[PDB]
Amino acid sequence: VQKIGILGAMREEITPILELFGVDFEEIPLGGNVFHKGVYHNKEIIVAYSKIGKVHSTLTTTSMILAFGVQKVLFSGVAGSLVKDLKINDLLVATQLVQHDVDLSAFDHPLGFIPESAIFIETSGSLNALAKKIANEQHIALKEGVIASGDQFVHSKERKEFLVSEFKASAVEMEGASVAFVCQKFGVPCCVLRSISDNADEKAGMSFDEFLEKSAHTSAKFLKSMVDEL
Amino acid sequence: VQKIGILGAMREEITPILELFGVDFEEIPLGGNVFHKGVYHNKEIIVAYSKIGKVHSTLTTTSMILAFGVQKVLFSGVAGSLVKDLKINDLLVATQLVQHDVDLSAFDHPLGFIPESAIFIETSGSLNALAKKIANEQHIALKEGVIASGDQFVHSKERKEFLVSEFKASAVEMEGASVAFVCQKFGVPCCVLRSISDNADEKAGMSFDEFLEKSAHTSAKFLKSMVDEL
Numbered sequence: 001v002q003k004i005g006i007l008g009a010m011r012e013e014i015t016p017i018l019e020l021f022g023v024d025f026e027e028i029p030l031g032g033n034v035f036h037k038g039v040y041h042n043k044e045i046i047v048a049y050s051k052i053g054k055v056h057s058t059l060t061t062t063s064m065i066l067a068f069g070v071q072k073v074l075f076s077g078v079a080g081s082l083v084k085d086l087k088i089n090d091l092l093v094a095t096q097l098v099q100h101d102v103d104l105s106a107f108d109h110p111l112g113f114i115p116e117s118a119i120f121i122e123t124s125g126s127l128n129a130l131a132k133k134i135a136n137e138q139h140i141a142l143k144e145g146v147i148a149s150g151d152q153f154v155h156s157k158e159r160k161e162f163l164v165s166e167f168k169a170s171a172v173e174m175e176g177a178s179v180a181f182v183c184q185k186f187g188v189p190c191c192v193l194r195s196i197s198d199n200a201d202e203k204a205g206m207s208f209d210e211f212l213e214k215s216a217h218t219s220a221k222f223l224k225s226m227v228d229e230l
Numbered sequence: 231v232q233k234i235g236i237l238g239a240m241r242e243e244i245t246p247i248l249e250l251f252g253v254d255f256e257e258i259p260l261g262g263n264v265f266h267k268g269v270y271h272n273k274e275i276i277v278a279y280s281k282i283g284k285v286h287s288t289l290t291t292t293s294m295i296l297a298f299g300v301q302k303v304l305f306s307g308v309a310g311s312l313v314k315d316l317k318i319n320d321l322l323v324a325t326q327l328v329q330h331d332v333d334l335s336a337f338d339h340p341l342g343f344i345p346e347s348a349i350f351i352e353t354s355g356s357l358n359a360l361a362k363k364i365a366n367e368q369h370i371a372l373k374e375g376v377i378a379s380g381d382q383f384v385h386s387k388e389r390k391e392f393l394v395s396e397f398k399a400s401a402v403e404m405e406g407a408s409v410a411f412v413c414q415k416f417g418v419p420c421c422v423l424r425s426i427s428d429n430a431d432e433k434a435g436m437s438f439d440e441f442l443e444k445s446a447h448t449s450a451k452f453l454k455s456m457v458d459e460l
């Protein structure tokens with residue numbers, strides 16, 4: 001059968017995923033993560049939260065691919081908005097991702113760039129198109145854009161402005177670029193889906209605490225609607 | 231037989247390793263890395279460069295463990311010095327590592343800390359003690375201390391001061407903490423060995439360009455002397 005990996009960063013991002021699928025799961029620990037393995041609509045679904053940030057998410061994605069043999073990875077979670085048109089609860093899919101905190105400018109490399117890699121990492125056009133189709137049929141707004149990932153929770157106007165000017169990012173989070181990077185290295189289709197929890201400004205901690213649960217649920221519900229069409 | 235993973239970040243860090251072992255290697259590509267597999271003194275050695283930074287090094291380490299089944303990981307490369315007593319070419323082993331660019335302080339977490347993890351990641355006391363024994367027998371200076379890892383090349387007095395005050399780091403680099411983190415998650419002994427290439431200050435790019443080859447060779451030679459005793 002088809003094997004689909006489903007990832008969040010925090011436990012709160014996968015709790016609604018496990019509940020919404022509503023099937024039994026076997027828990028399999030590996031590399032400090034717990035993988036929930038279930039069968040849903042004739043597909044094997046493997047659900048896990050990575051824990052926060054780039055190292056955690058790189059490890060979990062690599063484990064999913066190498067140890068569980070998943071054929072697609074769908075990431076669902078929350079994100080900070082960098083643009084006026086992405087408001088609390090709104091959904092976006094990443095067309096490209098960047099590691100916004102990478103800085104080898106001492107050697108005149110562009111910010112975000114590492115030798116033998118690239119600034120922007122692409123996701124699956126096919127999965128992004130599926131998301132768009134579903135969103136239109138459900139009459140849900142869905143934006144497509146660049147997501148910036150780094151190992152800092154962004155809560156300042158100055159950092160937002162940098163992300164917009166340097167990378168033209170629409171949202172910020174801490175895991176998407178690493179998940180997409182790993183998938184691309186192994187030829188595995190990847191979709192990164194996020195629901196806005198905050199505006200990545202001085203009020204972001206507050207907003208995040210308020211909206212984590214609801215925004216996570218919104219993302220999870222949409223991810224399920226995608227899996228229903230795969 | 232015993233399987234030993236040997237990692238550098240850049241090709242220049244593993245070129246001397248491959249030459250110094252002086253055996254034939256089979257090249258095995260996986261996840262965008264090339265793994266050089268050889269037999270040396272009745273051990274299987276698997277050598278690779280990860281490419282620069284935390285995501286690259288997390289992926290390569292995870293691959294080494296999950297796909298090649300290595301039982302120990304030794305990292306060899308260069309680093310920026312944060313302390314007066316670590317000069318160009320000097321060797322150190324990391325007793326602990328930290329991800330110095332992790333910042334969840336918006337939620338009053340200490341810098342370097344991520345929920346469900348820890349600020350400091352430990353390495354193998356047994357391998358560090360072997361390194362110390364060998365260094366003493368060869369009449370080579372070998373320091374032990376905290377190494378700070380992040381996704382920026384550090385070349386400023388201000389950032390050095392932060393690393394010293396916040397984490398009491400002795401050296402800075404971009405991969406050690408991720409390698410040690412992965413190893414710890416999988417119960418695999420890890421040793422991170424670095425030779426100083428620069429002082430992580432405004433002159434660091436210059437110094438790095440000058441000393442990369444020599445410092446890499448110094449680290450590689452010491453790593454080989456460790457493998458000779460394993």
Ligand SMILES: Nc1ncnc2c(CN3C[C@H](CSCCCCO)[C@@H](O)C3)c[nH]c12
Pocket residue numbers: 009010051052053078079080152153154155172173174175197198199200201204208334337345
């Ligand atoms: N403003 C923001 N900056 C960076 N990432 C995010 C995100 C996305 N994720 C939410 C979470 C933020 S860190 C939460 C710490 C909770 C207290 O322990 C990470 O997994 C990244 C939402 N808003 C953000």
Ligand SMILES: Nc1ncnc2c(CN3C[C@H](CSCCCCO)[C@@H](O)C3)c[nH]c12
Pocket residue numbers: 104107115239240281282283308309310382383384385402403404405427428429430431434438
């Ligand atoms: N000053 C420094 N800051 C951070 N890392 C390092 C290192 C260690 N590694 C050396 C290398 C620095 S980035 C080199 C880019 C070369 C031009 O493309 C990374 O793999 C980290 C030496 N000096 C450093």
